[PDB]
Amino acid sequence: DVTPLSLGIETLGGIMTKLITRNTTIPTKKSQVFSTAADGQTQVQIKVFQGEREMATSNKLLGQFSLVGIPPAPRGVPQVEVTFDIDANGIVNVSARDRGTGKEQQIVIQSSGGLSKDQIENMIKEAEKNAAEDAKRKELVEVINQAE
Amino acid sequence: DVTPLSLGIETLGGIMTKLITRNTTIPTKKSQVFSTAADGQTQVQIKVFQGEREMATSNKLLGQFSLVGIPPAPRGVPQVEVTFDIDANGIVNVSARDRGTGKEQQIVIQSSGGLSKDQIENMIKEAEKNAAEDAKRKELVEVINQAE
């Protein structure tokens, strides 16, 4: 009836972009538009992560799939809508769709990534323990605004 | 007189963000506002690169400095103004200033005279030959859609 851990995707620089936050009631659905990181980029890889760390790869990887044949365009121009849908049984459907071409791909993931209650608890604690360390990143970000 | 190579900073994900593009008339001054990558981030590192590659570290590092003690705030909230001020002889004053606190630092770097005509042409040619490789990146970027 609620999600035990946050769910999201890895974005540029290894950032955990949460689509559904921990403790959201189920069923639920959330979508968000993303773009490409490189000029002339023709494919995108969706890496679905579960956990609380801002450093994506320190969370648990639940799925990985690609959308290919995006027509080459300047970085930040394509609109790739990514949707996380969680159904009444906690099945997580993740789809990515390129708005320009309509090309779409999706996967499914079992309820709560198969984790036991103890494993969930561990992950929450570990994330708390490492929160301060994750904040020691030094990078600068150029915001991409697709507003017309 | 003009810049023989682009000049910019490395942003999240190792991206070359050009502030002054190659062939810009000098002297000139260009500024752009950037933000933090992590929630509670208190340091930002300004890495100044010269060259055309989208992969920052494949360009020539000219200088590096930090702003430290940025007040903790959610990622993307702080506003760090980065300015390249270049004189008729290619000398660049690069400053970063936190808009919120006015805290700032700067470095003064030579961007001319450290490369031959041939080295310049070769760097541009090399970048052109490696552009397709940089384009094979698979990452997604977060975007906003906000009229200003």
Side-chain angles (χ1 to χ4, degrees):
Chain A
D1 126 294
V2 304
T3 60
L5 296 168
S6 303
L7 291 161
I9 66 166
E10 178 181 344
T11 55
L12 178 64
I15 295 292
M16 177 66 175
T17 298
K18 296 180 174 85
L19 269 95
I20 306 175
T21 52
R22 169 178 144 204
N23 207 38
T24 294
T25 74
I26 284 346
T28 190
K29 191 239 76 185
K30 302 291 198 183
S31 75
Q32 178 163 327
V33 173
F34 292 89
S35 190
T36 47
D39 288 341
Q41 184 164 338
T42 60
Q43 76 173 72
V44 296
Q45 179 165 251
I46 298 75
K47 286 177 64 186
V48 179
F49 280 104
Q50 178 189 36
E52 308 315 309
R53 304 225 12 210
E54 198 177 62
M55 187 71 51
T57 62
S58 292
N59 292 321
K60 178 180 180 70
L61 181 73
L62 300 185
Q64 178 175 311
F65 69 96
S66 289
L67 188 57
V68 298
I70 302 168
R75 62 191 313 274
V77 176
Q79 292 192 305
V80 174
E81 184 169 75
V82 171
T83 303
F84 277 45
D85 172 276
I86 311 186
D87 80 358
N89 288 323
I91 302 305
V92 187
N93 183 114
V94 176
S95 57
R97 173 171 189 280
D98 175 56
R99 289 187 171 172
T101 56
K103 281 189 167 220
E104 177 190 53
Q105 294 287 322
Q106 72 185 237
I107 62 170
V108 296
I109 291 162
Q110 72 198 87
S111 177
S112 298
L115 290 184
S116 68
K117 294 187 83 279
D118 288 352
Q119 284 156 2
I120 290 158
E121 287 185 21
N122 172 104
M123 289 182 66
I124 289 170
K125 272 207 156 210
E126 186 235 78
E128 288 166 358
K129 182 136 21 276
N130 289 278
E133 192 60 23
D134 282 357
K136 298 173 175 167
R137 299 191 75 138
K138 298 168 181 50
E139 294 102 338
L140 285 170
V141 312
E142 176 169 30
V143 73
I144 298 171
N145 189 345
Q146 300 184 323
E148 60 162 70
Chain B
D1 206 25
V2 297
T3 57
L5 295 166
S6 301
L7 291 164
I9 67 168
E10 172 179 341
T11 51
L12 177 68
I15 298 292
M16 176 70 173
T17 294
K18 301 179 175 85
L19 268 85
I20 304 173
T21 56
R22 181 177 74 79
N23 275 333
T24 297
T25 289
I26 66 182
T28 200
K29 277 214 314 178
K30 302 288 192 203
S31 63
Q32 177 173 347
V33 175
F34 299 90
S35 199
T36 51
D39 293 335
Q41 184 173 331
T42 64
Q43 176 175 359
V44 292
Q45 193 161 49
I46 290 84
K47 296 170 66 183
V48 182
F49 278 103
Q50 175 184 50
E52 312 310 318
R53 291 282 297 274
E54 185 177 71
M55 176 184 150
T57 61
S58 295
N59 295 320
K60 177 183 188 178
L61 188 66
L62 300 185
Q64 177 172 334
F65 65 100
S66 290
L67 302 184
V68 177
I70 301 173
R75 65 195 179 89
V77 167
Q79 294 167 298
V80 180
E81 323 164 330
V82 170
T83 298
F84 284 33
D85 170 359
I86 188 166
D87 81 2
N89 302 126
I91 305 170
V92 199
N93 178 319
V94 176
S95 60
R97 178 178 182 269
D98 177 31
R99 181 168 292 174
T101 61
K103 282 174 111 90
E104 61 186 72
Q105 298 295 344
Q106 59 174 57
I107 56 171
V108 173
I109 55 179
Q110 277 226 59
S111 68
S112 284
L115 292 164
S116 70
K117 199 275 148 202
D118 274 352
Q119 272 168 306
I120 286 153
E121 200 50 47
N122 290 11
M123 276 182 71
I124 298 160
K125 195 82 164 209
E126 285 188 79
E128 279 167 0
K129 80 150 57 199
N130 290 287
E133 202 62 25
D134 290 352
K136 298 192 193 177
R137 193 178 202 121
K138 302 169 168 25
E139 324 225 39
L140 284 165
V141 301
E142 297 178 331
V143 304
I144 67 171
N145 154 57
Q146 304 206 324
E148 244 100 69

